[PDB]
Design a protein around this ligand. Structure first.
Ligand SMILES: CCCN1CC(Nc2ccc([C@@H]3c4ccc5[nH]ncc5c4C[C@@H](C)N3CC(F)(F)F)nc2)C1
Ligand SMILES: CCCN1CC(Nc2ccc([C@@H]3c4ccc5[nH]ncc5c4C[C@@H](C)N3CC(F)(F)F)nc2)C1
Lengths: 227, 238
């Protein structure tokens, strides 16, 4: 079913599966801000599972394979969402409609301001590139499928085939937007190189999170099996 | 004369990158004394230090690099030096399944990595990257473009100078796509292959982040040392 879609059906499916916008719990301190981010991150987690279950090809995997991808990708997925949302708010991180924070606010927690600066710079980068919605969901899917792939294999080829298909889909969007051939491979390159920065941000996030917790394999399996 | 980076054709980009390539270095031990008489970390640290000096010289020959300020050259080098060692390693390990070719006299397997702690996770990741590169039949011409991408893109996110780096990156991408056109891949194959290569770079970044964590837990080249090294290059005999 997955590999037979057209790039149009690929985009539609990806657009449909998109999680809802969530609010933060209805001035701020360290403990205050971390509690609010944690509770928001925890509630986005449940919706991210529902989102993952609708990414074509993902339900074709064994449950163990699904947990491994989500375990590797979850923080990258929250960060790409955040950076997407904060595109039109220079200097600001849009965590939720009622939770828009500046870098000064990032100084509320020790060691968090670095992460904030990197997230702001990525946001400004995607804004500069005029990232479109249809391209965003394609990238978010690539993170899910790529992030854990080299850290688990007839099923390895299967993931790679979906990845190839998302690449096709990205190109097709770029051609429908009237980019030249040359411009198409250049934009593709620019988008995928940003993924390395997201991976880096995620690793710095985990480090900070382990200086204090991260969703366990068991919890992830539970939620994935509960769907 | 002097070429400007942005003027180069695909063939001139490749040739500049091929000619910039550093030599394969040997590990420094006495082949008479047993490998039980030496530290694993000792050998790797010594090799990495010597590779770093060549990495300076190599970075200066990447088109566009010297167009940047000293300060910017140093920031890029500081953020991508481990990823550069790591991609060189995965490349030369390609024909040695299950083994990492640190040097022609330092070919290590998994069980050998379990001696230093934390080091086994990284070894496994390096081995899988290496087998991914094999399965794709990565070419030397492609490897040089990837290595240059890493150098310029690793610290670009961390301002009209940025347009320049951005243009250089576009040129390297053009070069990769020319290489794949010349080798007879269709358009869709070219895009797919390019995508597969760039995604492997995120994995290398991951590996470098874990490498760095391990080294901070123990020496990492500081902004100042690198500054000293790039500045010292100007006093080297051409
Ligand atoms: C399981 N629970 C998840 C919770 N841990 C947790 C706490 C805080 C954060 C926040 C956070 C919170 C909510 C979010 N929504 N979108 C993005 C986003 C982020 C991204 C970053 C700024 N991030 C910080 C860091 F992780 F990078 F350090 N993420 C996760 C334990
Ligand atoms: C100039 C000041 C001192 N510098 C600090 C550095 N020490 C150092 C020691 C060991 C390593 C080794 C190493 C050594 C040699 C290499 N050649 N190619 C790849 C390669 C690698 C990659 C990895 C396996 N790596 C370990 C880890 F970092 F990932 F954990 N890398 C660096 C020298």
């Amino acid at each position: 079913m997955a590999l037979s879609l057209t790039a149009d059906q690929m985009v539609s499916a990806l657009l449909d599966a998109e999680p809802p916008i969530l609010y933060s719990e209805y001035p701020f301190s360290e403990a205050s801000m971390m509690g609010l981010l944690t509770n928001l991150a925890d509630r986005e987690l449940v919706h991210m599972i529902n989102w993952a279950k609708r990414v074509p090809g993902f339900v074709d995997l064994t449950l163990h394979d699904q947990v491994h991808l989500l375990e590797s990708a979850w923080l990258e997925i929250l960060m790409i969402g955040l950076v997407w949302r904060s595109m039109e708010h220079p200097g600001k991180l849009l965590f939720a409609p009622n939770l828009l924070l500046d870098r000064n606010q990032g100084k509320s927690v020790e060691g968090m301001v670095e992460i904030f600066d990197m997230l702001l710079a990525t946001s400004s980068r995607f804004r500069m590139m005029n990232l479109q919605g249809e391209e965003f969901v394609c990238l978010k899917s690539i993170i899910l499928l790529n992030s854990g792939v080299y850290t688990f294999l007839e099923e390895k080829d299967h993931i790679h085939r979906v990845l190839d298909k998302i690449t096709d889909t990205l190109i097709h969007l770029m051609a429908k937007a009237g980019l030249t051939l040359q411009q198409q491979h250049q934009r593709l390159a620019q988008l995928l190189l940003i993924l390395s920065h997201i991976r880096h941000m995620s690793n710095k996030g985990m480090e900070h999170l382990y200086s204090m917790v991260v969703p366990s394999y068991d919890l992830l399996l539970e939620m994935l099996d509960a769907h």
